[PDB]
Nucleic acid binder design. Structure first.
Lengths: 344, 121, 217, 107, 121
RNA sequence: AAUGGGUAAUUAUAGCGAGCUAGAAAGCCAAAG
RNA sequence: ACGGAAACGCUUUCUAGCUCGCUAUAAUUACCCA
């Protein structure tokens, strides 16, 4: 059997938010206790049309009043005197900060995203999300996979070409397909009592500040052990998983000196293991070939929200401190994760 | 109201009847309505157009009631979506579902709005 | 003599699988790669064609001394089990892989499951310009299970080849535990545990008590 | 009356070349799962046996037990087919032969 | 418009009238339009060319209305399919179905587009 | 500065679109007479 | 007191064999607006 497995022990330092596309709006959650209750809004409006309130509730959603605590749907269940709390959905506890340090402004989060969940509702990290993190470590370190993932002359700085890495049917030829020979399996469904909804904190250079954003990202608490079973079938893939001890160091060495250099140092976490950058909030420079995207990635922004000062502002969040941050005021990195492999 | 033989030509007319940015002559005759606000509306209906195939109508009538919530709510936020639900008679058509085959007719009606919006500019 | 025996086994899913279906009139802003379904119950189905297609290609690396390049270049231990079209005595071939249907529709309704097919958004990220390309593929859910029927013929040629063929069938089923039943596989989507491997007779007379010792070894 | 649109499903299906891993797809049509088909026979008794009647049905009921185990037509070693014979009832239409003494063989 | 005696010679002319990649001389005179974007259009019509045989026309007029949705929608995404529905007068022919025998004539018209596209390069 | 808010983009891309084996045999008849 | 009378184009026969809907793909990017 050429199926030599592995066991990639993913440990999160920064909170990791990944997938599901959808997002709750600012009328789809309840903050009464220190938890955010996200109801099943099909069961909300059904239970509330039975209380003869759907005429006022439709008028409640077109109501743009100041003092945003009186807009976030706790005030609808306060002013209309409803205390049953029997609705579909779940609850996640508060981050602790998860607003910009104002006690009166609590519950003033507006749009959370939704972390990826199976049909049982439990969160998990899929293997397809974890494999896109390995593929950046494997593309960036390999010299052959950096010389020209060119714009092909068919677009403006258009695409990796999709042919730098050999893949396909290749009629007449054999079938190598290196990344078919790396089979990242999905993680076990863990519990949604590890989810905290960190808020984005854009810390830019040349304007030494950390202007927050109205994005929430239900994401995993730090110091969480998540396991992936990665099997390989080829000698060519059996080397490249074994070389993650060299390349994930050499990627972060190549990435600290490229982008994390010229940022102030106290925000940046320490590794403690082999580092990896998982989805949703690790900037564009960890989802890319970071040394072949300097004149190409900034083409996409002739807008009001442009990526000024070349490389975009470092993406930080706020979450409670455990065991790490290496700076006061709780500045994590949104995706600074750590793994170590072992073969089974 | 929309039958099966007209609901795409209704949605073709509603995009044309929708206004454009007559000022700001930088690629002009563009809409005030944007693609991402429009795809937030279809993201509600597209997850019912495929649970109409699987499930009964007798279980979907909780979220079909919720489409009148959020088509109103998205209309209240931005004035561009406010014009869409007036021109494309969506709030009229949403109160007229009553079975599976109109739910799929309305959810194909929202896809016709996205299609011609992508087509016309 | 003539006997037909039956492998009443049970597929259990782990990180449940995708098995494609075209469904052209599917949607626009929704599922563009649907799972194949029973057209009357709309439940996820493991067809036998993708169960039989793995077990020739997974056993081609074990029971072919010479590399195949085609079916009907296999090594007469796969041919007498599955079948050829360019051999003479091994065309109809000792395995009827019946389809597997979603068995625990009540256990999934006992737990908190809304729909039997979860939908996952997947986002091919371009590695320059970082610009996205989402897809919504549809897969069966994690703790689904399937009634896996399999019928074995014993004609007037299986003198002692019944035991030799069952070293093969419990070499392809315990190798699908190491492989992925089609779909994407290299991104999860496949691992399965064949619970309750249990032979039985449905026609003829053949002692199966010497068979339920290597199936459950 | 159920959710069936068409009485024939079209499953999509391919094959992978063993070297070069190329797909070759096919769309084969297929009757849907929960159909019921009216099945009848005509067993004539031409007065040329006079004792073989009671043991021909032991072959016929055995023949319908084998189609419920084999596949009845088509690409059946990859899943398809699998008929199921229900509600068997032998009733004489012409002639005078006692079938209720025989209807226990069909059960 | 397309009759029975010309709709293949119409589709033969429309592929020739469609433009080619005049630059990028690596197997040149290739189309901007690709095979996989073209087979996504025929995958709509091929599942009606075989339900025209089975079913009535009186049940297919919900999806025949939907072909004007997605031939517009696929034209809005990529500019190569945008040229196909202009050269091959598809949006004109799709509004002219009205019975079974033109539905099968249009669905054989889409197969003639795929045939000559595979033929000419 | 507070405060009120998110905003735009992508919605699958590239392929394969079936291949091979069988294409009517044996009786009647005719032949052998 | 019809080149007519009498005469089943009939019996036997699985549209069948073999075939993974597959291959690659992080729900992600930008950070501002009033």
């Amino acid at each position: 059997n050429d199926y030599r497995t592995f066991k990639l022990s993913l440990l999160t330092l920064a909170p990791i938010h990944i997938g599901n596309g959808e997002k709750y709006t600012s009328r789809e959650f309840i903050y009464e206790n220190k938890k955010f209750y996200f109801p099943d809004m099909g069961k909300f409006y059904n239970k509330m049309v039975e209380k003869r309130l759907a005429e006022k509730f439709e008028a409640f959603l077109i109501q743009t009043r100041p003092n945003a605590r009186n807009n976030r749907l706790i005030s609808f269940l306060n002013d209309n005197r409803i205390a049953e709390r029997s609705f579909g959905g779940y609850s996640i506890s508060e981050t602790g900060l998860e607003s910009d340090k104002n006690p009166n402004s609590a519950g003033a989060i507006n749009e959370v995203n939704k972390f990826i969940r199976d049909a049982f509702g439990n969160p998990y990290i899929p293997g397809s999300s974890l494999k896109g993190a390995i593929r950046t470590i494997l593309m960036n370190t390999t010299p052959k996979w950096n010389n020209e993932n060119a714009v092909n002359d068919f677009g403006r700085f258009p695409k990796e070409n999709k042919n730098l890495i050999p893949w396909g049917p290749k009629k007449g030829k054999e079938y190598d397909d290196l990344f078919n020979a790396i089979r990242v399996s999905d993680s076990k469904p863990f519990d949604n009592k590890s989810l905290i909804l960190v808020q984005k904190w854009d810390y830019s250079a040349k304007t030494n500040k950390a202007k927050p954003l109205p994005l929430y990202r239900e994401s995993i608490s730090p110091l969480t052990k998540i396991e992936f079973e990665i099997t390989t079938t080829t000698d060519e893939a059996g080397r490249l998983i074994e070389e993650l001890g060299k390349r994930a160091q050499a990627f972060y060495k190549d990435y600290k000196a490229f982008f994390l250099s010229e940022f102030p140092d106290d925000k940046i976490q320490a590794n403690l293991q082999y580092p990896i950058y998982l989805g949703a909030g690790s900037g564009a420079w960890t989802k890319t070939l970071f040394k072949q995207a300097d004149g190409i990635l900034q083409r996409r922004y002739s807008r009001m929200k442009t990526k000024m000062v070349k490389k975009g502002v470092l993406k930080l969040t706020k979450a409670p401190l455990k065991t790490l941050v290496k700076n006061h005021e709780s500045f994590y990195e949104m995706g600074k994760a750590n793994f170590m492999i072992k073969e089974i | 109201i929309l039958t099966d033989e007209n609901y795409v030509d209704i949605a073709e007319k509603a995009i044309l009847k929708l206004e454009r940015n007559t000022r700001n002559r930088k690629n002009p005759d563009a809409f005030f309505l944007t693609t991402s606000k429009l795809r937030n509306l279809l993201s509600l209906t597209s997850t019912l157009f495929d649970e109409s195939k699987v499930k009964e109508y007798d279980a979907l009538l909780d979220r079909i009631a919720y489409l009148r919530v959020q088509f109103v709510y998205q209309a209240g936020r931005e004035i561009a979506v406010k014009d869409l639900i007036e021109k494309a008679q969506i709030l009229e058509a949403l109160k007229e579902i009553k079975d599976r085959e109109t739910l799929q007719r309305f959810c194909r009606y929202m896809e016709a709005l996205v299609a011609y919006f992508k087509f016309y500019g | 003599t003539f006997a037909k025996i039956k492998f009443s086994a049970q597929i259990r899913l782990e990180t449940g699988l995708h098995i494609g279906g075209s469904d052209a009139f599917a949607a626009i802003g929704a599922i563009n790669s649907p799972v194949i379904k029973d057209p009357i119950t709309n439940l996820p189905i493991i067809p036998g064609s993708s169960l039989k297609g793995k077990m020739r290609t997974l056993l081609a690396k074990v029971y072919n001394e010479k590399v195949a390049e085609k079916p009907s270049d296999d090594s007469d231990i796969l041919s007498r089990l599955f079948g050829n079209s360019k051999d003479k005595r091994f065309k109809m071939g000792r395995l009827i892989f019946r389809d597997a249907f979603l068995s625990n529709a009540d256990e999934l309704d006992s737990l908190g499951v809304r729909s039997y097919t979860e939908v996952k958004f997947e986002n091919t990220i371009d590695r320059i310009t970082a610009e996205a390309n989402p897809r919504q593929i549809e897969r069966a859910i994690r703790n689904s299970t399937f009634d896996f029927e399999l019928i074995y013929e014993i004609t007037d040629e299986n003198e002692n080849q019944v035991e030799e063929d069952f070293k093969v069938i419990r070499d392809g089923l315990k190798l699908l535990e190491l492989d992925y039943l089609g779909g994407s596989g290299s991104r999860g989507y496949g691992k399965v545990a064949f619970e309750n491997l249990k032979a039985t007779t449905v026609f003829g007379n053949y002692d199966v008590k010497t068979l339920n010792e290597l199936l459950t070894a």
